[PDB]
Amino acid sequence: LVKTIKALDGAFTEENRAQCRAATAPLLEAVDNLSAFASNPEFSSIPA
Amino acid sequence: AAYLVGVSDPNSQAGQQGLVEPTQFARANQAIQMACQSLGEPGCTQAQ
Amino acid sequence: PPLTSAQQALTGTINSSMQAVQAAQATLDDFDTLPPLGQDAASKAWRKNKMDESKHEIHSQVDAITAGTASVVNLTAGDPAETDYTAVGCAVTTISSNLTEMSRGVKLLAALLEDEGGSGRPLLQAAKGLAGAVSELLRSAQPASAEPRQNLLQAAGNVGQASGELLQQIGESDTDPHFQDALMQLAKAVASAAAALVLKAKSVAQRTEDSGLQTQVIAAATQCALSTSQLVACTKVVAPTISSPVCQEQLVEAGRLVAKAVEGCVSASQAATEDGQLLRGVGAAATAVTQALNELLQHVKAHATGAGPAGRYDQATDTILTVTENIFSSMGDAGEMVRQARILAQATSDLVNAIKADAEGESDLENSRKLLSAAKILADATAKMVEAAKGAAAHPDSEEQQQRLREAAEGLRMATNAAAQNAIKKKLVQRLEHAAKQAAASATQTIAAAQHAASTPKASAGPQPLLVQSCKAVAEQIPLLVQGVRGSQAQPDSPSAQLALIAASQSFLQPGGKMVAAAKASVPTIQDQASAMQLSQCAKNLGTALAELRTAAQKAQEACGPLEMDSALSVVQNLEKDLQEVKAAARDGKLKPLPGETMEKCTQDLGNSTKAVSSAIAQLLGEVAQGNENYAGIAARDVAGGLRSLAQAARGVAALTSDPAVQAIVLDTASDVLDKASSLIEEAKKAAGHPGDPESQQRLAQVAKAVTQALNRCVSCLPGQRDVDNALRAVGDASKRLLSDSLPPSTGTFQEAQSRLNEAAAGLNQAATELVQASRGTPQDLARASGRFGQDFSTFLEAGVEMAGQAPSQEDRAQVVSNLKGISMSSSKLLLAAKALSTDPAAPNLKSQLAAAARAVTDSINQLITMCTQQAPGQKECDNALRELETVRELLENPVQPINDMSYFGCLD
């Protein structure tokens, strides 16, 4: 995403803006993948 | 502060609270998705 | 005193033990206490569950009684004022501790046997007659009596036989009686060889001429005759318990003592110098220890005949099975038929030189002797097919030459399968049968000791248990392996039952070894000393147990290739077939749930298992993106057991509810999950076959979204939650209309919308305030407040968007809308926290997870009010502060979860 962040920094192009917007969908998947792994309650919390 | 006094009792049992803190992840997963909706807007400045 | 204070404490130990003996028989009369199972096939399977599980529970605890009996005889073998009487009281407690669980154990069996045959009453009277033999054995334990030792020996011998008679009443007499009665052929021969040597020791007594030396021979001989008669009494106890290793040390304990008795007697035989009886006494003492050696040679083979190790390499058997089809495919040519027999003679003999190499690197020689047996079947079948293929190639029209070729092909292919599978599964008989069974009794003996440790103080209020807080955890994990024991015996061929035993072992090792360190930590805590001796003993037995588990764990993991991807699909096939029977059973409408199931508990167990399987789903996608990973079959096995736990949890709440409409809902939501899960493993096999393909990566990712959609159908199918998805739909769909193409029709004046928005925000946070106030209440009250807060948000959403057009610049309006977007998304995550808070109210971290989400929306609305409303009256500064005061007020009401991670001194500054 940084390769498209530095490309869009100062670009102000509408068709070039969707390049980082489409690359965030594998990013938002893997972010929600580990949070789904973090939703496992034996790994999440242990009661006291 | 009042929580740790509850752990201070000898008959009380402490908890490991899992291996990872899930409250840090839910704030992080939300704030990234809060920014991706700002990324989803086609008209925005480079400061945002 | 006549007896020491340890024997005085042993008197109170005897009176405490014998009081529970007769009380256990009196509590036996309330037998059945049986809940109804009904016509439910899962309840009939649960009847099949408790049959095999409780059968091992009685079988486990009787071994410690047989070990506990002869240990008293080994301790009392010495002279008075030479016996640790404190260690004697340790062994009588664990006998009585197993006696307490024997009464309650067969009480469930008396209701069990009444359903099938109703012929359990001889098992009841033999058990009460067995406990009465311990009562007279406890009467023999008094040292103040002048009773002879043989009175104690013959009283203890009937206890070990009637326990095996009770084992014969159970039907789990797994040891063959030709080997048990052969011990009587050895033990009576030992005492005969002793008494013959005692008469030889009595013959040299008249040959002696010195005072004191003649009494030295007879006192060693009478002790040798006492110890060898003790061996007869010990062998009558351990005659069915030859497989139990917890009593095998006591055999060579007295086996060392009779060796001490031989060395004590053979030292006096050399004192008879220049004697004709000196020559016969050394040879008799040499044959006296030979019978103990020849028993011990059979005693090692008594354990070795069930434990057979062998290594299934199968580096040559794969070359055997490929060239077997070339004979039938090339039938009719003389040249091509005789050349394939020379390759099969080399492919079979390539395993023959490796089977003998496997026996050299092996420890025990049961399956290795069967490896010599199985390789001879591979050698003899390849010796008769060369002459059969010679006559079939030179004479193709002969019918007798072709008929002998067909019967010789099946005598090698299945025999190699008999050579391979018996090499690997009898190793698992060595591994897994010795894994769980020795771990079973050692687990519950700690449970019997800790319950005895908790009952040792007068008040059991707050014992601070490191064991009992984990005893209840591990006891649910105990019968998972034991259910797969007889299933591996019933199904030896399919490895999927045995592969589940590998997974059941490693899932038991993590809570198991944590208890053993806590067991050793709890050793000096008890004031009583004799209870801690077994606590020290069982921890060594658990230490003996866990070492053999890891040897069974890593080796059986490497026993076969990673082909668990295809077997994991067959697991859910057994679930959907039973669920279609449950679909027929829920159509009947008379379903009895299990007594362990609770409607408030199992719904929490449904959602916890829902997040558990989806956690491995995201783990499956990372291994799919790598491709050709051995852990892909591991994670597919992990999601099979998660859905299996989800299947019994869905069938648990199906029989608990009474509404027939939602019974079809919870079936159809669960059936659509496994229908989507069937599409997971079908494409993951295509994902494992095709590495580096990005097209299959996005395909199952869209399926896993629909899986979590179908998992959310299992969230929305609960009747406990009331319109919280509708509260999510009222919040969600009204905001998405506000994001895309929303303009207020009437702006009006700025003063009439400023006064309207502050009062509408006042009750908005108050509706959010009662969310944490109803956290202490019922979860249905949270569903009540979800509708009022979701409606008032949409009332506030129309009031917020009405003054959006009152701003002159739309970029100031879009800043307000994006800030209102941040309020709406924070309330959505507050609602996403509410779907688990009403699900799991008991979790304290989930309370503060919603409470921090409750503080997030209240801080996101005070900033936008500061942007929109006028600061010139100055009353809005008090208005933003009064909302945050009430939010932190009820946060102080429930101090169960800390806010941040700073320490005590970091909080003071």
Swiss-Prot record, chain B:
Residues making up the signal peptide according to the UniProt record: none
Compartment list: Cell projection, Ruffle membrane; Cytoplasm, Cytoskeleton; Cell surface; Cell junction, Focal adhesion
Source superkingdom: Eukaryota
Function: High molecular weight cytoskeletal protein concentrated at regions of cell-matrix and cell-cell contacts. Involved in connections of major cytoskeletal structures to the plasma membrane. With KANK1 co-organize the assembly of cortical microtubule stabilizing complexes (CMSCs) positioned to control microtubule-actin crosstalk at focal adhesions (FAs) rims.
Subunit structure, as described in the record: Part of a complex composed of THSD1, PTK2/FAK1, TLN1 and VCL. Interacts with THSD1; this promotes interaction with PTK2/FAK1 and VCL. Binds with high affinity to VCL and with low affinity to integrins. Interacts with APBB1IP; this inhibits VCL binding. Interacts with PTK2/FAK1. Interacts with PIP5K1C and NRAP. Interacts with LAYN. Interacts with SYNM. Interacts with ITGB1; the interaction is prevented by competitive binding of ITGB1BP1. Interacts with SVEP1.
Domain notes: Consists of an N-terminal FERM domain linked via a short unstructured region to a large flexible C-terminal rod which contains 13 amphipathic helical bundles (R1-R13). The rod begins with a five-helix bundle (R1) followed by three four-helix bundles (R2-R4). These are followed by a series of eight five-helix bundles (R5-R7 and R9-R13) in which the N- and C-termini are positioned at opposite ends of the bundle, creating a linear chain. The four-helix bundle R8 does not disrupt the chain because it is inserted into a loop in the R7 five-helix bundle.
Protein's UniProt name: Talin-1
Organism: Homo sapiens (Human)
Gene: TLN1
Residues of the full protein shown: 1443 to 1490 of 2541
Swiss-Prot record, chain C:
Transmembrane stretches, start-end: none
Subcellular location: Cell projection, Ruffle membrane; Cytoplasm, Cytoskeleton; Cell surface; Cell junction, Focal adhesion
Record note on domains: Consists of an N-terminal FERM domain linked via a short unstructured region to a large flexible C-terminal rod which contains 13 amphipathic helical bundles (R1-R13). The rod begins with a five-helix bundle (R1) followed by three four-helix bundles (R2-R4). These are followed by a series of eight five-helix bundles (R5-R7 and R9-R13) in which the N- and C-termini are positioned at opposite ends of the bundle, creating a linear chain. The four-helix bundle R8 does not disrupt the chain because it is inserted into a loop in the R7 five-helix bundle.
A molecular-function term among this protein's GO annotations: actin filament binding
Protein name listed in UniProt: Talin-1
Phosphotyrosine carried by residues: Y631
Gene Ontology BP terms: cell-cell adhesion; cell-cell junction assembly; cell-substrate junction assembly; cortical actin cytoskeleton organization; cortical microtubule organization; integrin activation; integrin-mediated signaling pathway; platelet aggregation
Coiled-coil segments: none
Keywords associated with the record: Acetylation, Cell junction, Cell membrane, Cell projection, Cytoplasm, Cytoskeleton, Host-virus interaction, Membrane, Phosphoprotein
Residues of the full protein shown: 486 to 1394 of 2541
Record region (Helical bundle R6): 722-872
Modified residues (Phosphoserine): S135, S244, S536, S716, S740, S838
Region named Helical bundle R5: 561-721
Subunit: Part of a complex composed of THSD1, PTK2/FAK1, TLN1 and VCL. Interacts with THSD1; this promotes interaction with PTK2/FAK1 and VCL. Binds with high affinity to VCL and with low affinity to integrins. Interacts with APBB1IP; this inhibits VCL binding. Interacts with PTK2/FAK1. Interacts with PIP5K1C and NRAP. Interacts with LAYN. Interacts with SYNM. Interacts with ITGB1; the interaction is prevented by competitive binding of ITGB1BP1. Interacts with SVEP1. (Microbial infection) Interacts with human cytomegalovirus protein UL135.
Location of the region described as Helical bundle R3 in the Swiss-Prot/TrEMBL record: 302-426
SS bond list: none
Region described as Helical bundle R1: spans on this chain: 1-170
Cellular component terms (Gene Ontology): adherens junction; cell surface; cytoplasm; cytoskeleton; cytosol; extracellular exosome; extracellular region; focal adhesion
Main function: High molecular weight cytoskeletal protein concentrated at regions of cell-matrix and cell-cell contacts. Involved in connections of major cytoskeletal structures to the plasma membrane. With KANK1 co-organize the assembly of cortical microtubule stabilizing complexes (CMSCs) positioned to control microtubule-actin crosstalk at focal adhesions (FAs) rims.
Region described as Helical bundle R2: spans on this chain: 171-301
Principal localisation: membrane
Signal sequence, start to end: none
